[PDB]
Design a protein around this ligand. Structure first.
Ligand SMILES: [Rb+]
Length: 160
């Protein structure tokens, strides 16, 4: 239910990508920058017309010129700081949205740009638990910058 690959999430060709976000849905930091660049202005514009949400919630937009149908914005910080709990909620909420849209293929990054203050392995652990709990109609892809990293993530998923 989760496969880890080297690639560019702005090149994922499935139903949706998950984009880590502040709760004000003001995009730009991290992978969002590339998403705005290649996806175009309509992604922030739709966010502007959703308004702000709560930390731990997710919100859905179209994907502009990207080869996915939807972007799922997962609010990990803002009005309160990122923690293992906000990470858990934002993941569960992102996946809940995907299920609501009746989607099958969804892609996350490592959320690294958003969890600098947290212990990496515990963050990976919590998102993994939420992903595991998600229904089997979903196929989740983790996308990483380097093969070395993705092979590390796959190797780590062999710890069981
Ligand atoms: Rb931000």
């Amino acid at each position: 239910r989760i496969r880890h690959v080297q690639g560019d999430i702005t090149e994922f060709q499935g139903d949706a990508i998950v984009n880590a976000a502040n709760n004000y849905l003001k995009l730009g930091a991290g992978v969002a920058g590339a998403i705005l660049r290649k996806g175009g202005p309509s992604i922030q514009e739709e966010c502007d017309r959703i308004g702000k949400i709560r930390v731990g919630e997710a919100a859905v937009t179209g994907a502009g010129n990207l080869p996915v149908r939807y972007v799922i914005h997962a609010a990990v910080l803002g009005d309160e700081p990122a923690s293992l709990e906000t990470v858990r909620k934002a993941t569960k909420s992102a996946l809940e949205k995907a299920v609501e849209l009746g989607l099958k293929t969804v892609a996350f990054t490592s959320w690294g740009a958003w969890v600098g203050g947290l212990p990496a392995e515990a963050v990976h652990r919590v998102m993994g638990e939420e992903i595991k709990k998600a229904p089997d109609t979903l196929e989740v892809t983790g996308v990483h910058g380097t093969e070395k990293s993705a092979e590390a993530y796959r190797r780590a998923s062999l710890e069981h």
